[PDB]
Write a protein that binds this ligand. Structure first.
Ligand SMILES: [Mg+2]
Ligand SMILES: [Zn+2]
Ligand SMILES: [Zn+2]
Ligand SMILES: [Zn+2]
Lengths: 528, 60, 54, 96, 66, 89, 189, 116
DNA sequence: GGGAAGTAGTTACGCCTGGTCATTAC
DNA sequence: GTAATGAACTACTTCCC
RNA sequence: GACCAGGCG
């Protein structure tokens, strides 16, 4: 029934896969008509998903909040070079024959280096060191050992321009540019039997796929549109870039079909290549970044995956959570070290789900009757089917009568519950510990004073966060592993970290100094 | 590190991703960071133990 | 003999089991949350779950 | 009405304590969570149609090996963004 | 993780003196957090290379021979 | 989007709140109805201005005026009394 | 084809049936998961018999329900293409005749009913041969070979089996007896 | 199907009659108004409809044609009991689906083994 | 060849307040 | 009225006379 | 939603 992901493999998408997985082809460089409905064939077509309420995705039915979206594709007029694989194409080109497709090596060397690649393949540095030797030794040879044929050096200029140096005469040579329609044909002829020597994999990484012919379009849900209160539409940067790409492609196709001098198509081709290169990555070396109407450089696919706000360090590693609270802290030495004071305002907002059993039916039924406005109470009840019902002033007296085994009640916090207490920055492992709840009338968190050192807290404006686990396994883990009294000894140096501080030493010295003496009433009062 | 995602999440993400795409690398999800990214339990602490139960139990 | 990780896992598993319909093996004062019932069962030494160790 | 952020050092602290189930609850259960249909034969994400309640893989004609996987929505977005470029991630399922 | 945190956390309370005394007895050598950064990062050549040279049984207890 | 009728409790028939009237969180200060949103036809949208969900006070003054291009404009102020308590700096 | 096959599987036992012995609880669970859900490659599940072996429970994180490795025997009826169907015509229809073959009703096309031209007589809502005077009515017991098989999903109703009916050795028992009389006449001549 | 298979056998509908009669009597003893679900009582009815000859006799016949000739497989033995053939054309049609066809003298012998 | 010299990659964690956007020539 | 874009650091890689 | 500026520990 329920499976888990076991492994992930990477590769390069072939044009067949792109053309098969796509749901629609985009031709029209527009998004919305005058009424507000998506334009058929545009970058906002319904077949790729729906966002605005009241619309249905005809690809999979669904609604505006339960459709995951579907892909699209664009048929490029002429192939272009992927910027990410730019250097690898150069390394491959300058280490293979120009007209047979074979590598610039003999059979003995091929066997010798295959016997070396066979072992130490699971490692990275060694496998990279091996590849560099092959490229270095095959770069120098100027004649193919497999077929008698002359060869010429190749110059690479960033980002996606390749030069070929050819001799017009013995002392006169001219540079020839290699257009992508030639690089793809050259790359298509390499046999798969020597691909592992170049470091590729014939099954799922083929050299001719690094030159794009069809470009996929991300679904609608990957680039949402926000409707401003002024009536104008706000669209993501990817939409604008795709519109520009589509317009340029359409103009190039029309010019090619209608006939034109070479100087026209050979410039539109460069413009399209620049647009695609900027679309994939907007910080490529040696290219003016695309600029928005406001002057801010656009964000693109490469920028969404890097930085402190990228998809990796921004959402995957850390994300915002649901059940939490934040407020100031104040001292309270009258509670034990493993308790924390919680305002009654917060305790009536955060809820702990509970399952009704035969040993707690009475308390739960009593709590439900109080409603959501008296302190001991609940906000929701869940029937065995799965429906969620809100407790109201016209529902408590009848919902408390339907309660039976198997139901779920989202009650308020009580004394005895366990919560997680945190202060940022989290420097070491003792910055998060579990405390027992104790409700107080005012609106600040109460903390015992001997617990200050591990938190490094001081009562001059500091704030702390509070988290509430929801599942019984999480509660058990917090109760057994994260208790305050279990972390008296510091793991850094094997000494006590929680202890007396400030007055706890001065009072002790005053009590235990020489000549100190007390009367009966003082002794009885202090002991009590 | 063998895991592609563990290295990619640290620094120079795009270069690592494209290199792994070229090499046809395989990630086995045997680490800690990758399992956190997916959402399945980590193998570090409590997620290491395994326990069994004898079913025919009755209240004593 | 149990390592604290094993103890926490066992207590969590039993606490989850109790809150779904499994009968309690010991008498408990009324109003007790299921986690406390599991803790009481563990300290009474009547927990039937066992751990397999390589 | 926003929520607090569980940063990366908080995850490292939770790891250092060793509470895996607490990590699962905090990082996944209280955040985005979804179910995705995965084609077992080819590794691509399957398609579910509401019009006739039929589930099939679009790229390859497979309709029996379709399975359900529970994952965070952000990782699905990451997979979609990787597929936006020519990189193809393939998923290999396992039991349990 | 515990070892990494136990190494990282105390570094935030690092102090620095940097006397820079002209005395040959006190060799000017970088110290503290920059030294820890150099050691952990495995710098190819340290900013202030230096050696400690001991003497054999002879020349050990004399000034002129040293 | 019509909220509960309890919130439109102390709005005068011209759409403006009476001064010196107590207001709680989510109470409506100015009632405004936007034109319908194209897909819902013939259905005006409720876009009233309301007090912040976690505030409380008493209305102090109401000002009516005209902007630089003919549109109407209203400004409302809320007065709240605060006594020292725990946590104040 | 009614058949008994031994199968290995892993059974989940919810907390409610913890007090009950593992064997019968596992039996009930297998009834629920297999009695309605059958496999095309194996046929249609009919009756689960006694389960002989069970293993210790494995508790996984999340569900908290015990999982047991189980080997059991199940009686299955598997239809095979090109097989002699023994069954009665449950109902008939202008595009085909519904034939009870097992857990599913089969469809005998009107082009597959006879060599002779057939017509759907509406007086009794039945089939009748043009020149043979042969008739098919609800409740008739027939034997026919299979030509086409089809099976879509684990719901039994969505299955169809096409039966050839002209081929020798098939038909209603009456005209089979007539063919036997013809064979006797030819062998005596 | 679960993990896989560990064995396989073939049965006659004469045996299927008493197999379904089992579930019949057990569920009536348990107090079920519908002791067999849909197509289960149907399977019982269809099995008993052609089950004049007893199930144990069907197994004995299976073993008799086991000893009679080596090429005979228990599936075919169950089939011949299930169909009750009487003449050459009957078994010719019966086996024409399978690759193997029945020899006429072996057919006469199966006529004797079929008995009632 | 081993000296320039020119790329190329990084630079702590939360939280709060307010203000501005999100084309134009005909 | 709308279609149209206009400062520090450190380690590699490339030279190179 | 993204930017800019200023504060708190
Ligand atoms: Mg402070
Ligand atoms: Zn859809
Ligand atoms: Zn060659
Ligand atoms: Zn597939």
């Amino acid at each position: 029934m329920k499976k888990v992901i076991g492994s992930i493999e990477f590769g390069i998408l072939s044009p067949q896969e792109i053309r098969k997985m796509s749901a629609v082809e985009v031709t029209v460089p527009d998004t919305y008509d005058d009424d507000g409905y998506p334009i058929e064939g545009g970058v906002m077509d319904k077949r790729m998903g729906v966002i605005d309420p009241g619309l249905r995705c005809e690809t999979c039915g669904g609604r505006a909040g339960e459709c995951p979206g579907h892909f699209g594709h664009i048929e490029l007029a002429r192939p272009v070079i992927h910027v990410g694989f730019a250097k690898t194409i150069y390394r491959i080109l300058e280490s293979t024959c120009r007209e047979c497709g074979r590598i610039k090596l003999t059979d003995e060397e091929i066997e010798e280096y295959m016997k070396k690649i066979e072992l130490a393949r699971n490692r990275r540095s060694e496998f990279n060191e091996i590849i560099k030797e092959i490229h270095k030794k095959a770069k120098e040879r100027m004649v193919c050992p497999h077929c008698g044929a002359p060869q010429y050096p190749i110059k690479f200029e960033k980002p996606t321009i390749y030069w070929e140096i050819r001799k017009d005469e013995q002392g006169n040579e001219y540079r020839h540019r290699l257009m992508p329609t030639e690089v793809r044909d050259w790359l298509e002829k390499i046999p798969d039997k020597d691909l592992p020597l170049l470091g590729l994999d014939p099954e799922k990484s083929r050299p001719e796929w690094m030159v794009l012919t069809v470009l996929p379009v991300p679904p609608v849900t990957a680039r949402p549109s926000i409707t401003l209160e002024t009536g104008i539409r706000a669209e993501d940067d990817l939409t604008h870039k795709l519109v520009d790409i589509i317009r340029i492609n359409n103009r190039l196709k029309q010019n090619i079909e209608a006939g034109a001098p070479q100087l026209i198509i050979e410039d539109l081709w460069d413009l399209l290549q620049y647009h695609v290169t900027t679309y994939i990555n907007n910080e490529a070396p040696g290219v003016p970044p695309a600029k928005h109407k406001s002057g801010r450089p656009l964000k693109t696919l490469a920028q969404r995956l890097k930085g402190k706000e990228g998809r990796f360090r921004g959402n995957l590693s850390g994300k915002r959570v649901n059940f939490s609270a934040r407020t100031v802290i104040s001292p309270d030495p009258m509670i034990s070290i493993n308790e924390v004071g919680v305002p009654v305002e917060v305790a009536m907002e955060l809820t702990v789900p509970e399952k009704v059993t035969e040993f707690n039916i009475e308390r739960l039924r009593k709590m439900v009757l109080n409603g959501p406005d008296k302190y001991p109470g609940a906000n929701y009840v869940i029937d065995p089917e799965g429906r969620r019902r809100r407790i109201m002033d016209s529902n408590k007296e009848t919902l408390a009568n339907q309660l039976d085994i198997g139901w779920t009640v989202e009650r308020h916090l009580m004394d005895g519950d366990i919560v997680l207490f945190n202060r940022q920055p989290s420097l070491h492992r003792m910055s998060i510990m579990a405390h027992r709840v104790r409700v107080m009338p005012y609106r600040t968190f109460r903390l015992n004073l001997a617990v200050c050192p591990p938190y490094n807290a001081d009562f001059d404006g500091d704030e702390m966060n509070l988290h509430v686990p929801q599942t019984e396994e999480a509660q058990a883990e917090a109760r057994i592993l994260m208790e305050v009294q279990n972390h008296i000894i510091s793991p850094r140096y094997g000494g006590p970290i929680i202890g007396g501080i400030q007055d706890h030493i001065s009072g002790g010295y005053l009590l235990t100094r020489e000549g100190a003496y007390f009367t009966r009433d003082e002794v009885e009062q202090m002991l009590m | 590190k063998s895991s592609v995602l563990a290295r990619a999440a640290f620094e120079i993400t795009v270069q690592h991703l494209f290199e792994a795409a070229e090499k046809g690398e395989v990630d086995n999800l045997n680490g800690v960071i990758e399992n956190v990214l997916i959402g399945q339990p980590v193998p570090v602490g409590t997620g290491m133990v395994k326990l069994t139960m004898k079913l025919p139990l009755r209240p004593q | 003999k149990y390592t604290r990780f094993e103890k926490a896992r066992i207590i969590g598993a039993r606490a989850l089991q109790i809150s779904m319909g499994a009968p309690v093996l010991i008498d408990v004062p009324p109003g007790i949350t299921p986690l406390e019932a599991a803790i009481l069962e563990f300290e009474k030494g009547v927990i039937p779950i066992t751990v397999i160790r390589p | 009405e926003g929520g607090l952020r569980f940063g990366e050092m908080e995850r490292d602290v939770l790891v250092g304590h060793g509470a895996a189930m607490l990590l699962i609850e905090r990082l996944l259960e209280e955040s985005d969570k979804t179910e995705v249909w995965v084609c077992e034969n080819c590794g691509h994400i399957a398609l579910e149609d509401k019009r006739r309640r039929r589930v099939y893989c679009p790229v390859c004609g497979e309709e029996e090996r379709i399975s359900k996987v529970e994952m965070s929505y952000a990782f699905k977005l990451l997979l979609d963004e990787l597929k936006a470029m020519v990189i193809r991630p393939k998923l290999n399922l396992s039991e349990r | 993780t515990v070892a990494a945190q136990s190494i990282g956390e105390p570094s935030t309370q690092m102090t620095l003196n940097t006397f820079h005394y002209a005395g040959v007895a006190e060799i000017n050598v970088t110290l503290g957090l920059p030294r820890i950064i150099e050691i952990v990062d495995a710098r190819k050549n340290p900013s202030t290379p230096m050696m400690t040279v001991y003497l054999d049984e002879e020349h050990r207890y004399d000034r002129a021979k040293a | 989007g019509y909220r509960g009728e309890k919130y439109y409790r102390n709005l005068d028939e011209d759409g403006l709140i009476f001064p010196e009237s107590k207001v709680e969180g989510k109470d409506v200060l100015v009632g405004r109805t936007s034109p319908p949103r194209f897909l819902s036809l013939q259905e005006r949208r409720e876009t009233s201005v309301a007090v912040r969900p976690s505030e409380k006070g008493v209305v102090d003054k109401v000002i009516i005026t005209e902007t630089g291009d003919g549109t109407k404009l209203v400004k409302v102020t809320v007065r709240d009394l605060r006594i020292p308590e725990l946590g104040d700096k | 084809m009614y058949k008994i096959v031994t199968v290995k599987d892993v059974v989940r036992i919810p907390p409610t049936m913890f007090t009950m012995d593992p064997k019968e609880a596992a039996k009930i669970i297998l009834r629920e998961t297999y009695e309605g859900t059958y496999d095309k490659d194996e046929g249609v599940i009919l009756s689960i018999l006694e389960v002989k072996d069970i293993k210790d429970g494995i508790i996984i994180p999340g569900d908290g329900a015990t999982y047991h490795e189980v080997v059991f025997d199940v009686l299955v009826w598997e239809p095979k293409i090109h097989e002699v169907v023994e069954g009665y015509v449950a109902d008939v229809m202008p595009f085909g005749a519904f034939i009870r073959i097992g857990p599913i009703d089969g469809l005998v096309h009107i082009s597959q009913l006879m060599d002779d031209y057939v017509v759907y007589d509406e007086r009794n809502k039945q089939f009748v041969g043009k020149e043979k005077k042969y008739l098919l009515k609800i409740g008739d017991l027939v034997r026919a070979r299979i030509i086409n098989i089809s099976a879509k999903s684990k719901v039994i109703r969505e299955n169809r089996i096409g039966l050839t009916m002209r081929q020798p050795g098939l038909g209603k028992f009456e005209w089979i007896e007539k063919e036997k009389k013809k064979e006797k006449e030819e062998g005596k001549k | 199907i679960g993990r896989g298979k560990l064995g396989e056998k073939y049965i006659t509908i004469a045996e299927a009659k008493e197999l379904l009669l089992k579930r019949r009597e057990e569920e009536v003893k348990a107090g079920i108004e519908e002791p067999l679900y849909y197509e289960a009582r149907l399977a019982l009815e269809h099995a008993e409809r052609f089950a004049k000859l007893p199930a144990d006799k069907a197994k004995e016949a299976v073993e008799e044609l086991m000893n009679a000739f080596e090429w005979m497989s228990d599936r075919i033995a169950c089939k011949i009991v299930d169909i009750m053939p009487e003449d050459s054309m009957d078994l010719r049609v019966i086996f024409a689906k399978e690759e193997y066809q029945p020899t006429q003298e072996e057919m006469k012998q199966i006529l004797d083994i079929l008995d009632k």
